[PDB]
Amino acid sequence: MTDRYSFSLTTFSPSGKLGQIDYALTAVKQGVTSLGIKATNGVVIATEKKSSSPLAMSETLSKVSLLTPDIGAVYSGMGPDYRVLVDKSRKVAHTSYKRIYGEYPPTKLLVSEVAKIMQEATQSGGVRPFGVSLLIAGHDEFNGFSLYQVDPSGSYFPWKATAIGKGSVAAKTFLEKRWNDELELEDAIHIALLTLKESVEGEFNGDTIELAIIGDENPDLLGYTGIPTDKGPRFRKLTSQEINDRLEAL
Amino acid sequence: GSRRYDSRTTIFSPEGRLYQVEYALESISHAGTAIGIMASDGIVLAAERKVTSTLLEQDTSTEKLYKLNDKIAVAVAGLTADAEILINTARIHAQNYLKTYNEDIPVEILVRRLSDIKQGYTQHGGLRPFGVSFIYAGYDDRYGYQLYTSNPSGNYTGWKAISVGANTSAAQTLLQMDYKDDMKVDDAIELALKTLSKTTDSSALTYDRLEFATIRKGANDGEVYQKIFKPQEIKDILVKTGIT
Amino acid sequence: QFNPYGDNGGTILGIAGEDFAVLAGDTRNITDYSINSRYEPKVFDCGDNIVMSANGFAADGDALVKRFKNSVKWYHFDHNDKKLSINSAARNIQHLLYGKRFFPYYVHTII
Amino acid sequence: MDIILGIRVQDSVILASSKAVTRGISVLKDSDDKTRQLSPHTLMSFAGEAGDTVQFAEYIQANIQLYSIREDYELSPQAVSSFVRQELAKSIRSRRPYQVNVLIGGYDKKKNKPELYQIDYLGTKVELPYGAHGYSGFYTFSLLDHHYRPDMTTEEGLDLLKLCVQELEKRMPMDFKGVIVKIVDKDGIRQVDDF
Amino acid sequence: GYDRALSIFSPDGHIFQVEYALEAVKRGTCAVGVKGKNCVVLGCERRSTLKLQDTRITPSKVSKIDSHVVLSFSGLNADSRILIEKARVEAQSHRLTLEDPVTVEYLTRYVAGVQQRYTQSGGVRPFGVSTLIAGFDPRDDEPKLYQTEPSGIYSSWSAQTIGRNSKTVREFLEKNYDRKEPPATVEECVKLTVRSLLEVVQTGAKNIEITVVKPDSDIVALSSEEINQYVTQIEQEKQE
Amino acid sequence: NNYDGDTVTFSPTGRLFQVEYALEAIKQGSVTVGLRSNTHAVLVALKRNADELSSYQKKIIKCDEHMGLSLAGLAPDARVLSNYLRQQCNYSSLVFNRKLAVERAGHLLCDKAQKNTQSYGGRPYGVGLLIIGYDKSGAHLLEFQPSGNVTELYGTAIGARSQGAKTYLERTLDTFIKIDGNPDELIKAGVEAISQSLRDESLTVDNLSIAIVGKDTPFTIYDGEAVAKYI
Amino acid sequence: GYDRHITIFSPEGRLYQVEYAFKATNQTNINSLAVRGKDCTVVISQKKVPDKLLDPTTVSYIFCISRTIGMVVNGPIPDARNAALRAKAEAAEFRYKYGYDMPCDVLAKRMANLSQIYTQRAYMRPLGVILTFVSVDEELGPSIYKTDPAGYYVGYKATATGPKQQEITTNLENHFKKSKIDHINEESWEKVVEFAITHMIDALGTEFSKNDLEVGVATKDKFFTLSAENIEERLVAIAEQ
Amino acid sequence: TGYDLSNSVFSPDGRNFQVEYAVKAVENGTTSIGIKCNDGVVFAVEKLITSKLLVPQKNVKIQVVDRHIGCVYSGLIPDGRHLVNRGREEAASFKKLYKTPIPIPAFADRLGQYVQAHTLYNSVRPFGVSTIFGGVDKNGAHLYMLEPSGSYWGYKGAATGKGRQSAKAELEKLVDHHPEGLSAREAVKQAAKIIYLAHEDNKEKDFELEISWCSLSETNGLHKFVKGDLLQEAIDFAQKEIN
Amino acid sequence: DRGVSTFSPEGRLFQVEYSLEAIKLGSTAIGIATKEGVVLGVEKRATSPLLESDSIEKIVEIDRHIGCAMSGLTADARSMIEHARTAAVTHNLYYDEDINVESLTQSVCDLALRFGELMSRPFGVALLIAGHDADDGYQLFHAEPSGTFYRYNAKAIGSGSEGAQAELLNEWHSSLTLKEAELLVLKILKQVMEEKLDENNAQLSCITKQDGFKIYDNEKTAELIKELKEKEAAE
Structure with missing residues (x-):
């Protein structure tokens, strides 16, 4: 009994590659396309809710997740791996930050913590790397809006806009043409919806697309009043109805 | 049992080298070149980013150059995430020393402990080594300005000028050719940028593919200042030496 | 509060001659002002021609004697049935007693 | 233990420490040296609980000597005193704290200044022109408040000390059997033999 | 904990991990120790495909373990630091409990024991290091030189060398060192030591280090010229 | 073949080869014999020497006043197992004031050996044991094998060429089983049984080892001049 | 390829051990199906007792996890019981720690997480089972949530599992295309059971006696299984139609 | 391949070959059975007489757990003992916390979960026994059989080892011919017969028969060994039937 | 590869058998027991003439009444000697007497199979343990990395x-004098040694009841070598 796997399962080959990390990235390649775009007054992250059977209720499977009231995540690769990373990311925001400083962490620092967790699955004994890439969008008081990509190695990079998974080469090209430093949030939502049509096969409506924003504070989403300095979450998931409203004027 | 799947990361080859250390060095040799040059009045750190996209957020970015404390910085060649693990360790180590002795940590002492951590992964525990080489740039009141490198073997050495990552062979030859002991910081800045300019695998060296830092005696009398260059500052210093 | 010790009374006595030795003890056993038994032996043959008594708190006395008897048995097992000499018994018993230096056996022992 | 004093003058630190070691109604020894050299320009005197004092002193000595060899370099008096403070501040919250008070007198060769640190068993550190632990301080502080000058010579410092030892031999109820005096300056540590 | 028996026996009765550790020693820069009548000298090659080295700050090859004992080595540099630190800690601990600095034999026996332990513990590989340990026992004037190797065996030597091309320089010392008459001075002993290194080294430039250890904790490193004087002078005695 | 790397691996026919190899060290072991009547139980063991200059390795170990054993195979493994028995007999005495039933001794040994056949990293014991004792239900003989199988017998033998003694004892069954009230006659039959397993050689004075336990007889071991009576 | 023996990635980014655990899922050759009523959630699974020596009452792949949650397993019984014991313990602990009954979807997520761990940590094998959890949730209403050896899980309008799962799946999709709603529009659970059995019959093209099926029903505040008798009474009503 | 070299590895069909290899060790063992009866259960087993030298009656193989449960098994005997030791610890801990003796279904899952746990890791080997066990609790009699995979079910009657097929056929006849039930004293006799019938598939060495039972009316719901007159009476009824 | 505690198909432990090969490569050690004492002698075998041979320590004191010589991977023996010395002194502390030679040897041998996956491999050194005790007199034991030990009248290893x-x-023979045994050890050592036996490359020692365990100085052994050649010449 007990874990006798205390040695690394990821190691250097003679050419210098870390095979398991490369292979994890390959699993990310097969994954469904997701992307993020940074506007001047917001960030949008989106992906396709590709359902497994039509008997499945795909509203019960959220690919875009709130981490803090001002930070959201989306991924490409292995869904189950992502789900547990979200669980851990949410928790580490509290244990390693909020319980200490009385406030939620800034985006890059939370990203830093997730990256640490993913790096450890690349070196610790008896585990394989996480088979996902994350896009994390957030806002914080002193850095404003930001967007980060985190890969299976634990490496992360800040982006103006990017995409991952299946059709990411084509989608990165599309975004290069359309991105400028003057995009207003609504423009970035529209560009996100256009880019995502390229990679989607079947139905393309508000029930097959999942899309969230980091934008203005939402006092109506707070749940209480009377603390002037608490103004509400900047993270908002767009509804099925909200997505369709934007698809007609497309 | 599990023995079947153990790669044995900490054994000697029949020649008496450490496979995983050698293979980690092979990995590092494909990373963005980083250069350190030491002058009588300061130190330069210059490093080349890994083949950028136009959409990368260049100004809120950091991949190559990190601050360990106010008197010490490192340039990274290898796996970024591996490097962050070691950097946080090094930052904590520095603060423990300051807490214990009420004095900033001597550069070598910090370098030695990080190198000892790397060494441990090559001798026990059966884990893969960190795929990282560092260039350390720092100042203390015992040796003044100092440059060191460490690599996955946990071996460290001091330098007047050194490169790590891709094309260190070409870079070392060029540095050897033009380096002089009495050199100033501003000459060293130029030497670093020209060396990257000639060894780079890209067509031309632009501001957006670089990180750059100096450690000078460059404020008010006897006290040391670290300058991590903003993108615009790299753009200017690139013109100011006539590479663009 | 619980008191882990009691006092079972009695007294013991040992005298050595030129080619013999005696170890004597009364056979009464008491607590407070009551007699528990008029015949409860507290002097024992431990093997290898050694007799032993550990007089005071009987529960401690019995535990000690048992541990020493067992010590003799393992001495044979471990050292090719060699006879445990009286000097060697005494030194062994010192270590049995001193092992509980901070929670003593409440006995005066004679072999 | 009982009497340890320190005075920092222009160019040196002087430590005076009583020689008596007493248990019950017997003076067991009258030539005890209540001091350890931590490095060639740093000296530590100590008083407090029997056994604890020497064990702590020698433990610090071993650590500083180890540091010296490792770096081929001598820690500054300030650095050593901070190390010592931290050890005592840990100790005070242990299962059994070191009940030891210390004075650290060192010559800092980078600054060319003598330095005197007073640290109690709680890890309470202070840098002072003159210091004392125990009942001694109740006489010597006010005496030194009066007679001490910042610019005194080593020789004026020794006279100032004679004044202290005289008062203590007059008013203290115990016979502390005189003091061993040591000077710490740019040339290291030496002992005055007729005091 | 990671447990693997990495040092184990092969059918011929060899422990390959220990023997491959010796290969790492063979690849290391050369090191020599020669004892005189009244001193010991330690010399070390430093390879010269490294110019732009900063010599003020690069770890030197001879390490003081205590004020009266020194240790040099050939093999993995990172491995050697671990042994030196342990040896340094043990030296202070010995002073603390025995109230006397270590004998050279004692310190050697300790370092050797550490090396041996790493050849029969799970989860660790042997040290890729051999060492020369030299000095003088407290209050003694008889010089001391010992060698240790990855297996943990240690022994005393009149003079000895380790690392690359040590077979060439052991050859030299074997015909040039007279047991009956050891280099009766510092000057003579340093010379013989530099002569043996020149059999293997190149130009005696920034390529030879020398450290001299005399009794009562008298240990001094020579700098370039003082060495260079020996280099020049021997070469002039050579044209014959 | 591919399935004999460790004890934690079944072969495709359901065999455990590392256990089978442990069994093989028993087969290269010097011969020993056990047999009993209704009043006594006896061990006879042929001791092996290294050469003419050496001692003849002990094969008989006392476990308690009423119990002991003989070994064939790896001796250090017998020392480990006998030491465990000594402890178990001893625990029964100190805690329950009760001499350990030979049958429980058997079950305890089976269970101890079994653990080493189901977990990674350990190995099976490489020794077989014959256990005799006299308890509250009379005389007993037990055969222990490192597979964990323990078996109660009237008589048996283990080691090289133990097949001869075992056939002899199989024929002699009705004779020895009723050598009650007679120590020296149970022994002689045991010494006879062991003789059916000798080759190139016969029983000498520093070569033969006998033990007996029974109704009014502590487990005692005879070697040297005290076995001359029997050759 | 040792990347085929433990849960590390293959060069094409795949986990073979997880894929082979999916193949063990069908070892029992049983099909199961679950549908939602208005008021209830019904699950049915085939019951096959080959050996005459078996006590048929002890042969089951349906489990009462809590008062409110039922679980049916597709996969070998030892792994199925392992999953059931764990889910029972997890549901009890949740109730104790948080003061309310563990929701079906939350238990599904929790078991899905445990399965995810076996796909990432080498020393644990995946369980060769698929787990269908059912309840009438106090917030969400009739609920079906299903777990697999990859650690994937999702809610369903209805679902099916086993070797002939595709047949049953398309059968059910075709009904929901026609009906245009999310569930069986029926008041009584008896009729939702009748629907389930009826659509299993069309899709598999076989008839069932009372001992060929096994049925579990979830309502507000209880999950229960049916006896051979309650099933016969249900078979009888389908026949008279 | 090499999928079969390490316990807990799925082969590409979805099998754990090490467990299937453990089953081979079980099939190689002696025959053992259990018959569920009116108000109880009966267990019997074939003990090969290796030699004259085995002491008759004194190498017992059926094992009691708590006071109301019998266990018999075929395969590697030590593995069976290890499993019963665990069963005993599980029964003690149930009784300690809950006071009532452990119900048979409850007991069956404790063994099941433990056996199943030995198919989860490559650092242990699966159990090389199939185990037949059961007894009487507050809900009546129960009989169970448990495989190396950890698979178990409730049985009307059960058999394993070399003669499992012959015994299975024999058991099937009793289940068809007695749909109202078999009495405990009746079941003891049938058990003897079936062990004798099943000994056909193993007839090199002759054998010693061993029987045990729990019956609410005949043993007061406790496990006892069948010896003496009742044993010989059933040996004779078996002898009669092979002739 | 294969686990460190694996049996061969012949029922032997691979790792133990392999350590026995390493011992065969070791320098020679011989011991002879008499009624007047036990002699232990070894071949020093310096790997090079610059190595100072008196620093070669292959004969070692365990207690006043017990000595030990070694052959094989001799660095492996340090911890066995350390254990031996502690077991001897500890026994004297607990029992106020000398520890039996057999008991000491059994204790050393208890270390031997404490390897696996406790140390990582068997010891690669064999020992000759020689001493006196009041019960069994002069004794010589050969302790192997198998955990087996054997009493011997005389024995060579290496x-x-x-x-x-x-x-x-x-x-x-059963009546050799100590002097006869010393010469015999010297004689057999000169036979099997590569280099020519002298007082610098071989070493003698004995243990007698009366003076305990002594290592002979080089002057004293030189004479016994001189006396040995004169005996051989004279017939």
């Missing part, structure tokens, strides 16, 4: 052992 042992088979 490279020249199969030759030396046959020689000891012929020369040993």
